[PDB]
């Protein structure tokens, strides 16, 4: 319709603003279908996600609304943003399709990780990660599912996070101990994940690969050592029964886990290793915080007040998580967000 034109993408019809051209599918749901596209107004490459059946049921509708509000809580260059949101329908009554537009990045971290990186690129990428994470946390959003496949980059060495919790890597490998043992978590749950990613950048191998959670825990203790009693006390009896009765591991020292041979200054190597020893800590009570990681010498070189201390436009209200509405009620809420 006038401002819109249609493109057949497989069995799906994309009806989009004429500013978006050169569409081609790069992902499919499940949750929706994604096309790479050229935005002629911004002269930039974008990703366009068409939500799959957002109004099929209350679950789909709530999820759609939640994604929209989460995106409005964030405004930071190290996090994927919502450049635009539109529907080709002209009234609430016929409102049916929701299109989300975000930045098109070049690739995820999976392959970048497997290649040799100088300390500058390593620390700068991690700095950007920590900036995005801090912004998320300030916005009342703890990711919990950070991994190479949901962190994306461009050839200019810029980095953005998406998925507030191809190639494809299962989460799990990167999930914090408190998560896999079901202990509950706080902000620094995301630091463990950063630690796993940093450790993998350093040796181009997954630190803690397990067929399942149980085997995961084993790889963790084999390398880092059995946690203290005061930690195992925080465990639910069933989990404690298993964990407390494994063979006892002293853990390998960090110089042994990440020797100099894996690094290119001998100073920078010792600093990276010190940071790793503070992130890869089983007990969240003893794990380094985001603010402290940012201030760490390995990271602080890149410090910029505007990038670290930038407050989010909104704080996510967790009350939404328990709220329920009929389909039509969710739909009106979503229509309002879209038309705004």
């Amino acid at each position: 319709d006038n401002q819109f034109y249609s493109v057949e993408v497989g069995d799906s019809t994309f009806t989009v603003l004429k500013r978006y051209q050169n569409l081609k599918p790069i992902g499919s749901g499940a949750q929706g279908i994604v096309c790479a596209a050229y935005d002629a107004v911004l002269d930039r490459n974008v990703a366009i996600k068409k939500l799959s059946r957002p109004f099929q049921n209350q679950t789909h509708a709530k999820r759609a609304y939640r994604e929209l509000v989460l995106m409005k809580c964030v405004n930071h260059k190290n996090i994927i943003s919502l450049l635009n949101v539109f529907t080709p329908q002209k009234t609430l009554e016929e409102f049916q399709d929701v299109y989300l537009v975000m930045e098109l990045m070049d690739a995820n971290l999976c392959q970048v990780i497997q290649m040799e990186l100088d300390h500058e690129r390593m620390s700068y990428l991690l700095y950007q990660m920590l900036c995005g994470i801090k912004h998320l946390h300030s916005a009342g959003i703890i990711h919990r599912d950070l991994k190479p496949s949901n962190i994306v980059v461009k050839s200019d060495c810029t980095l953005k996070i998406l998925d507030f919790g191809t190639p494809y890597v299962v989460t799990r490998y990167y999930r914090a101990p408190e998560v896999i043992l079901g202990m509950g978590y706080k902000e620094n749950v995301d630091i463990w994940s950063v630690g796993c990613i940093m450790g993998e950048m350093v040796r181009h191998k997954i630190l803690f690969p397990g067929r399942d959670y149980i085997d995961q825990w084993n790889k963790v203790i084999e390398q880092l050592g059995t946690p203290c009693p005061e930690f195992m006390k925080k465990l639910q009896p069933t989990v404690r029964n298993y964990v407390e009765n494994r063979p006892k591991y002293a853990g390998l020292t960090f110089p042994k886990l990440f020797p100099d041979s894996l690094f290119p200054n001998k100073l920078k190597a010792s600093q990276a290793r010190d940071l790793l020893s503070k992130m890869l800590v089983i007990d969240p009570a003893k794990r380094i915080s985001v603010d402290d990681a940012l201030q760490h010498p390995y990271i602080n070189v890149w410090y910029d007040p505007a990038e670290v201390e930038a407050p989010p436009p909104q704080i996510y209200d967790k009350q939404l998580d328990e709220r329920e509405h009929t389909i039509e009620e969710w739909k009106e809420l979503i229509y309002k967000e879209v038309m705004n």
Binding site: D106, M115, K154
Partner: peptide
């Protein structure tokens, strides 16, 4: 130091 401006994705 100045920030990296290139990243080789291969």
């Amino acid at each position: 130091p100045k920030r990296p401006t290139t990243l080789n994705l291969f």
